[PDB]
Symmetry: C3
Subunit: 289 residues, 3 copies
């Protein structure tokens, strides 16, 4: 069985003083298509393979290709995946909760380097023999994530640095907790990174949360993000502040709104200020299909 | 929702004295696949994204990729599209009416340079930041087309030449009229091009038409194409003559036939003579799926 | 009509002393997706086009593209195909019968060079104007195969070497026979190769066969492969020995098993020894979807 799903997104992307002789405002857009093949068995074991084909404005050669395959096996709530895997630090809950705008960005996101699913090919050739193994599992309302990423599996292992990550999250109906930890993240030796986050649903309509991170060898240092959102019908308002230890950094912040036009259609915008005083703004749509 | 459609075509392509040590006759063939994702809303607004994957004999690396995305929004007969758009000069009716053979070619087609939907990637990198906006609408039996193409939207606009085009066509059951006009076509400054055409369905089986063009800065000069077709059951006969102002040019002409073998299957051939006395012939099939 | 099918495979691939500073054991995996468009007619003629998108671990740029199109026409048991065709030497029965392991390999396979369907693009550019014509037909339980492959159809034919192949196989319920012959195989002048094979189903569960080959200009010389398999429920045991004329070559051999876990799911392994004493082992899964 083969199924196809994905999403399109387009709108305006403003970056104050982008560059000498550059336009600050552009039309940014993304097409994402996923090809999924699955084999269900009567034994209860499911086999799967996924490929992504992603295009973004500005991409080299005005063309689209697929990425590197991901394969998995699922049985009784346990999923083992091989190849281009989702990593633990990139999959836990709460870590991307401050993202806003139609491009889902936030300076409140972790300012570290770590491996994550690769959406596209990489012309530099660095991903050619990259191969990860991942394992996910769910006890009660607990989600467990584990991932092992080998940047070049053909080369003797004593010569390459492997990335290892673990994460768990948990949620009842009002509190959410999450934590992750990865060593040698992004294959950078000694770049050990951590995350702890918690959220409180103080209503059917509002939630506040707080994320803390150890950014490893990044120049950002430790970081804290405080965010909150509130829904008024089909409209959601979101905001966040974030600080990093880097001397002289500014406080980053953002304010945005989401409007659920229809099932599968979402109009979003935001105005954000980064740690180096960058001003960024956006407004556009996402539709899922 | 994701749907796939497209077509295959193959047959013989003859070019008299193609080149020293080249074969005049080859097997030319094309595979075109379109991936379309759509999101229908109960509000009446439809969202869409399309990608094309096209392969042609002789293509570099013996491979296929997708092109650059096209996105659109439709509401009440109005469609706005962004990215790799169809342009006004390329979409009006009647402008390609003389095309024949299984490759749908004609020297009677406009001999100018103008932007059009890009089927494939471009290795030269010229299309990397190309971005168009297009708008179509239909009053009675009137079709209105408008398009704005920015060859490099990241660069300050005072440095790049944008293409702007408008077109309309109209048809009752016997007369057809169409006109288009585009300035700085193909991003060439001062290359303003125009088209006017008209057709007369003098029967259920026969039609005659005439197309005139201002080819802008091309060396062809103004051009006139006179064509006609006539259907005998599943068989269609077509012919056209065309002249350009270029001194010493020959009159171009073509004669071909189409045979509708089955729904979705069409066998075509033609013999054409160009403006520089080139002799070209073809015979093959197209099937849609 | 467009349909999608394919398969995923993953597991461990061991090559004794692969290379200085290389890992002998890797995770090898393959994702194959086929896109097939067909047009059925009421006349009985079917038109088809196929494209493949294949990714393998270690592939350049960590990406996937499609290959070169294949087109065909089928009528009354006769199929003519154009472009990236299956060749006669690569399609006859019995020639790959000794293949085992989850990667379906065998040193008992023919050690010659010959054209075959191209799965992927080729960066070297050698396949750019490659074009084959193929014809298959089936009398009783007879299968007839014919193929003509032109490595560069744009160039004058007196300058290029074309590959021509024929094959037939036949089977009742217990004996199988097959033979093939191709001249200038792989476009190498004078590299004429041949194959004869026969198999005996000495049970519902067991089969023994023997394949002989003239490897043309290869350094292997003539070759003989003797193989056998036997099924015990969902488990299949397979083995083969193979010899080549090359002086000092070793006898190659392999032993493996296949376990049919479920419809569409197959777990395989093997231990093989090549003609130069190479030791290779594998274990993994294949699932079809
Ligand atoms: C500002 C640089 C020049 C680009 C022209 C800006 C014109 C804006 O777009 C007009 C046509 O519509 C498409 C743009 O996508 C963004 C629209 O807002 C998203 C839906 O709420
Ligand atoms: C990103 C999708 C893959 C498409 C990119 C292929 C890149 C090919 O170019 C690599 C650079 O070398 C130049 C190639 O020669 C011409 C390419 O093909 C011609 C028709 O579009
Ligand atoms: C300056 C060039 C144009 C690009 C900028 C578009 C940025 C537009 O503003 C972003 C949206 O601001 C969100 C407001 O926060 C309040 C939310 O509730 C109000 C509307 O539903
Ligand atoms: C002329 C150069 C060498 C190529 C051989 C020409 C042989 C013609 O094709 C024979 C096999 O069939 C496939 C060709 O596609 C064209 C057939 O006509 C189209 C359907 O009406
Ligand atoms: C046109 C479809 C895209 C496929 C073209 C990829 C072009 C890659 O080559 C660019 C030129 O540089 C050489 C690349 O190194 C080898 C490529 O991949 C090997 C297996 O086929
Ligand atoms: C010379 C190498 C072969 C390639 C050339 C094939 C060209 C064949 O002729 C094209 C078809 O000619 C069309 C004829 O116009 C009359 C139409 O009605 C008659 C048949 O239905
Ligand atoms: C040996 C080099 C380092 C690679 C680690 C080997 C660990 C083996 O895999 C553990 C995780 O599972 C995925 C591997 O695919 C092969 C499993 O066997 C196939 C099914 O029978
Ligand atoms: C194999 C699938 C096709 C993808 C390969 C495209 C190969 C492009 O590189 C050719 C070598 O030249 C370097 C290209 O410049 C950067 C590429 O695109 C950037 C984003 O991934
Ligand atoms: C040495 C690193 C690991 C990689 C090697 C895996 C190789 C494993 O063995 C292959 C399977 O051997 C097949 C045995 O033949 C007997 C068949 O019946 C028994 C089991 O069903």
């Amino acid at each position: 069985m083969i199924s196809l799903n994905g999403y399109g997104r387009f709108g305006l992307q403003y970056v104050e003083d982008r560059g000498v002789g550059l336009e600050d405002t552009i039309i940014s857009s993304r097409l994402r298509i996923n090809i999924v093949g699955t084999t269900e068995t009567d034994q209860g074991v499911t086999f799967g393979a996924a490929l992504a084909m992603q295009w973004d404005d500005g991409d080299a050669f005005a063309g689209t290709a697929g990425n590197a395959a991901q394969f998995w096996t699922s049985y009784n709530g346990v999923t083992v995946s091989v190849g281009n895997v989702d990593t633990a630090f990139d999959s836990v809950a709460l870590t991307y909760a401050s993202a806003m705008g139609y491009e889902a960005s936030s300076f409140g996101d972790a300012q570290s380097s770590f491996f994550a699913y690769n959406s596209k090919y990489d012309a530099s050739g660095a991903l050619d023999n990259y191969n990860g193994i991942a394992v996910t599992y769910s006890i009660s309302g607990v989600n467990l994530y584990l991932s092992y990423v080998d940047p070049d599996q053909t080369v003797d292992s004593s010569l390459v640095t492997e990335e290892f990550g673990i994460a768990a999250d948990w949620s009842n109906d009002m509190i959410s907790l999450a934590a992750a930890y990865t060593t040698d993240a992004g294959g950078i030796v000694d770049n050990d990174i951590a995350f702890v986050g918690a959220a409180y649903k103080f209503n059917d309509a509002g939630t506040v949360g707080l994320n803390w991170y150890d950014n490893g060898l990044s120049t950002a240092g430790d970081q804290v993000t405080l965010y909150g959102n509130y829904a008024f019908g089909a409209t959601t308002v979101r905001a966040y502040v974030s600080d990093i230890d880097r001397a002289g950094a500014d406080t980053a912040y953002g304010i945005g709104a989401d409007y659920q036009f229809a099932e599968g259609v979402k109009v979003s915008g935001s105005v954000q200020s980064g740690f180096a005083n960058e001003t960024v703004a956006d407004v556009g749509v996402r539709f899922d299909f």
